[PDB]
């Protein structure tokens, strides 16, 4: 062929997860019998608007908008939270882990 895929780009779903195009909150969590949290203030959430995630795979962004409407706020900004360490960016991690997840799951199965 002229060439034909020669270059390093190949990828169906993402991994990145860029951070500052999300909003990001860190809180102390407030919970009236939940987990153990005395006094570890350190939560992450993670606000996106979902349809405005041009890094997100266009058949993906929908899903999102279905599959994690829960997590959806109302206004399409999906919003989530995750915490379990004293550390900033863990916890954050783990946002962003299920993120990537929530996408996986929307984009196709592969193991699971």
Known sequence: ????????????????????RL????????????????????????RFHLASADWIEEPVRQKIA???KNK??????????????????RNLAECLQKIRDMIAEASGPSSG
């Open 66 to 68: 279905l599959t994690h």
């Open 23 to 46: 909003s990001i909150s860190y809180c102390r969590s407030s919970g009236p019998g939940g987990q153990n949290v005395n006094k570890v203030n350190s939560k992450a959430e993670v």
């Open 1 to 20: 062929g002229s060439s034909g895929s020669s270059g390093e780009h190949a990828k169906q779903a993402s991994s990145y997860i860029p951070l500052d």
């Open 72 to 89: 959806i706020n109302k206004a399409g900004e999906l919003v989530l939270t995750s915490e379990s360490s004293r550390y900033q960016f």
